[PDB]
Amino acid sequence: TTALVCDNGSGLVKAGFAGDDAPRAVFPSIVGRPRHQGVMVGMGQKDSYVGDEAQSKRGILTLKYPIEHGIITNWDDMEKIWHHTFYNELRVAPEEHPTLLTEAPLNPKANREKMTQIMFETFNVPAMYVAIQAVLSLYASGRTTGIVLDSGDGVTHNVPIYEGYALPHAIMRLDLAGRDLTDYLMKILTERGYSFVTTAEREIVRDIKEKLCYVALDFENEMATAASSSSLEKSYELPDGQVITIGNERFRCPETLFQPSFIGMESAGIHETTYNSIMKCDIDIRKDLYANNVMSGGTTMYPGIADRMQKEITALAPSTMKIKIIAPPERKYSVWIGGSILASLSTFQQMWITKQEYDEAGPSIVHRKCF
């Protein structure tokens, strides 16, 4: 009996069996409903579409994400996603081997309680556990001292882990993410006179951002270069066949991670919160956290975000204590790979929340047994 692992990404679910190298199922966590009167009788319609169903039909649909900012906002959509995950794509009855689910830290208590409830009552899973993603990124990167910048959709957070101990008071959480990058990128593209106004083309701008964006190693010289010369501009075929051409706007979007002030965000960016997260730590460990400094999650995939982070923290750190970055190319999957190895540890098999214990203690069980 091999456990299941699936990751409740705020944008893209990742699922497979424990001890697999990379997930078998990957599909956007998106639920599509038709918004038009279909005329044909005998069409063979169905009510609504999940994941890879709703991508191809998106022009006909309205698309909702049930998860925003690591919070499951519509559990009735969410159930459909899990149902599709286990039965349709995996071809597994979840009742027959256990399951592991992954969460951003410090999200509201209900997300754990109601996820556990739905797992035991609805799917009748043998046993369950939930785990902090930025813990698993260290299992994935092969380390036990770490500071982790984790950014998916929805959430960015810093969690320090020194020699296997977490430091709860040092956790930083922030709400810049690929969604707010995209919703900024549409408004900056409007400056060129391109318009994207409904959900079915948000999924176009997301692909534009994925292919073309990059981060300036130093921003203001390259902003002036773009104002000086067009050699930065590159062009993209919209799905119909209309070309669009984009210039400084492609780097200006991922800059907002470093200057959230463009979004109108209150906080500092991921560099200065990373440094403040180290500054919360005691002075014995900071030297080690500067070396084992890890990038995790897909929003960290922009070309050059590593070298930009290394530069801008080097300008904050003491000159003598050298600082490093770790940014493996897999890292989009690293939270899953870490969950896959974690679930397969013989030592872990005691840790599962079994259904008997849940029936004893109720949905409150999670906070007691789990981190």
């Binding site: 925003e68 900012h69 919070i71 906002t73 509201p108 709400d175």
Partner: peptide
């Protein structure tokens, strides 16, 4: 969420 933000 429930207050300080859309969710």
């Amino acid at each position: 969420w429930x207050a300080x933000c859309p969710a």
